[PDB]
């Protein structure tokens, strides 16, 4: 949607002065993704760390994967739903 972002002028200073009117600050006060793009990408770091630690074999010999008895490490990846604590975080619930 560029045709409605043609009208957003004065946005670097508007994004910077949110420190005086917002408690929770933002670390990326200098870039604005709609106007400026994704200026950085860290996807290859997660690939090279797994070659750095030695691979999935030398990671998984530390873990408890051998005692579970999955067939393959590829089944470690799912859309895991939290279950109990998802239900419990919304209830009326003491500070402690």
């Amino acid at each position: 949607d560029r045709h409605t972002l043609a009208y957003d002028r004065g946005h670097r200073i508007r994004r910077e002065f949110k420190q005086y009117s917002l408690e929770r600050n933002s670390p990326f006060w200098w870039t604005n993704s709609h106007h400026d793009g994704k200026l950085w990408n860290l996807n290859a770091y997660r690939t090279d760390v797994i070659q750095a630690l030695g691979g999935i074999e030398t990671i998984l010999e530390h873990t408890l994967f051998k005692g579970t008895g999955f067939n393959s490490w590829e089944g470690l990846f799912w859309e895991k739903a939290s279950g109990f604590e998802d239900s419990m975080q919304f209830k009326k619930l003491t500070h402690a």
Partner: peptide
């Protein structure tokens, strides 16, 4: 498979 991320499906340079 759908579930694995793209940081695992990527082979590095030196496996090519």
């Amino acid at each position: 498979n759908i579930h694995i991320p793209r940081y695992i499906r990527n082979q590095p340079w030196y496996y090519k």
